[model samples]
Target chain A: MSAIKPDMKIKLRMEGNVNGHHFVIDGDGTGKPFEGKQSMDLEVKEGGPLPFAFDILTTAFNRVFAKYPDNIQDYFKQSFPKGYSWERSLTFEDGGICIARNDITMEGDTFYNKVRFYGTNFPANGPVMQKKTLKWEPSTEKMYVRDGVLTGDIHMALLLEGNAHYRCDFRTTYKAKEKGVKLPGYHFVDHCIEILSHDKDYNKVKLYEHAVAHSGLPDNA
Target chain B: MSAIKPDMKIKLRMEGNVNGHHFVIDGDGTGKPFEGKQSMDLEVKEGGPLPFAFDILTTAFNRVFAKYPDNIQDYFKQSFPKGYSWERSLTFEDGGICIARNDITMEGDTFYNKVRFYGTNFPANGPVMQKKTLKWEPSTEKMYVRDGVLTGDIHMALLLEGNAHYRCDFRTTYKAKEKGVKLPGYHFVDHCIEILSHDKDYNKVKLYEHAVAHSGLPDN
Candidate 1:
């Protein structure tokens, strides 16, 4: 069994539409869900994370606390003594839901990670019942890197509750290094997040996704 | 010695950058400065003409009162008994200035229209002395119309006072007709306002110009 090498650089790509808002999140791992650059189609008067996506993800991450088992809650509290970085309450009509695979195992040279979702308002009860776990397998194909910039197509998804909220198909490229030199510490940069499709309700709606660049890790993370 | 046909449709285009805000105003004529559609590189929480551009022009138009002569003011009151359509006070850090042709004449099938300027804040005194009247000649070249939509590249300018404030070079298009029928009354539509350049003080400062559809004639 092979574990993901901690020192290896990682990039996350998100491209999809949500409620007519199109956004993209691309960047390197900073030991958190997502941190890096972003852009969207909406007219942004100032610079920062797109508010819509930021709020949705904030609620989704926080909802995990409500679903944890007694022992797991204890472990989470110990692991993150100060609590999650995003502390905002859900403000939308429908809150976000997330179900992630807590297990990580290796078979031969392959690693498997899984998560699922639906809108937070789903199920009307404690734990999600219709959840579907989709495996996230690292691509065997090597991505080309020049001066610490990697570019490739990455498939990803967004979950809420126990349903697939959106499917992201990313044509990804990013700057993982500076001036041809690789930094010892992980750094996030240049990300292009594109939206492909969403649930049936938004099947016909065209929205703009927010995209950004060089977003650092969450402060608490 | 040519006059513009009253029935002809007019489109105004503004392209330039202010501060760091990039925008475009492209649309049909409503006998006004600007009216129609718009786009920009900023997060618009709500709708309507971007506020930054709208307020600047508003103050610019109002500043005219402070600079008009007594006789011209009387003539203006007589010509527009109802008074200018837009009336407001200058609210910006720098009150805008304006110097216009202030002349109008109709000769046979031709009309002579002229107005020139610098910035919203021009003319140091009650009356501007450095103003020039440049005749506005109707384009001799006929613009093609498809379903009552005419597209062309038009040149326009906006002055705030004595300084050449903003220059507009527009690649304009609009729907002047409905269902292939030209409306007897003028109408305004889609507009794209882009920023090209600005004063040296604003080299890195961000600015927004309000663009609207069916923006009626400047009141004064």
Candidate 2:
């Protein structure tokens, strides 16, 4: 953040009121089911990370696991019994391109990760920021930031359970206007539906499907 | 970061082998009068924030406040009675222009903030990725990622007492090789040395000065 002078008072004001925090894992809602708890709203603040929106995704994942542990774990273990990772080249409705990669391993009680993301022309040609991942360790707290160069530990991590979990959350908020529909739908950073899930044969459960009502995400089937 | 497709594994090779977390705050060593625990190194990482380095700064701050609480706090309060902030325009050896802003506030144990950073051609001709300020708050433990649009919360924070503190660490790390100075002094984002303290003319203890040996930061 530029414009910072040493020893000068910073001003805080009434600044956030984000909208929509929806989830639809592997097309679960339309054909399967979505936990009532999965629905949430986005949270925005002045110079902060987008937590509420990301939290909803993981929270819903917990709900599904609780009820369908056996069935879900069957496929989960195929890729993540030990660990799993993938690279994705996706886009937003705004004609921008973002390449992402995530590597996750459940080592002991911690999930180690090496995630990276690079985006160009976000919000109609705004800032181009990126993140490179490292094998994460187990801990209740971890910190990382990027202004131009790297800060904190890139070795990201989180615990196996708890609301304070910080694993799945990467890539900060999608910057846009403070208020308004801001376009509507996961229209926030809407991506093509084709690359949404890990297409494995064990996924007979059919977790990825188009359910625009349940998830604001765009279904580019 | 959950959007996966399987069959591939990730490589975890980046560790803290790189050394960049150095320190030089308020003349701690070469500048004297400043405590000595302020010794540290600066580290640069791919796709990460620059704290382990700034931790060098805050850690020094805590050390300074510990022994010289009244003396340091006098100068601190003069400018930061209710916490302070500033807007600075700086450049790296690469000739990239970076505009940074920070909003700092405090509590028994949290340093909250709203930080905004805008850069234009960091290496002289690069992207002008501009970041806006988002309010500072306690850790929500939130994480997000998107494909083409905005990904997650731009909001950031750091603990006043511990590591979560989010105020002072703004402005991206300036670029330069880790060798004998291309310039001299705190060039990573230097501010006004003349307007350091004495808001009410308590000019006895001048807290700001020049010290290159302690920190790898170049002079502007």
Model 2 misplaced stretches (Cα beyond 4 Å): A1-26, A30-36, A39-179, A182-201, A205-221, B1-23, B26-220
lDDT of each: 0.24, 0.24
Compared with the true structure, the alpha-carbon lDDT of candidate 1 equals 0.24
Give the range of the ten consecutive residues with the poorest summed lDDT in model 1 chain A: A58-67
lDDT of 1 by residue, B1-220 (tens): 0122222232223332323334443322212111211212222222223324432321111111111222221111122212122111221223443222112233332212221212344333312223221111111111223233433222223333432223222222323111332222221111223332333322222222222222111211
lDDT per residue for candidate 2 within B1-220, as digits (tens), equals 0111111111111122112322122221111222211121122233344222222122111111111222112222232224444444434223444455444444323333344444444321221111111212221111222221111111223223332233322222221112221222110101111213222212111233221111100110
Local distance difference test, candidate 2: 0.24
Which ranges of candidate 1 are over 4 A from the true structure? Answer: A1-93, A96-108, A114-221, B1-196, B201-220
**A1-221, model 1: which lDDT tens digit per residue?**
01323222322233433333344443322221122122222222222233233323211111111112222211112322122121112122134332221122223322221212123443333222232322211111112232344332222233343332332232223231114222121122112223333333222212222222211112101
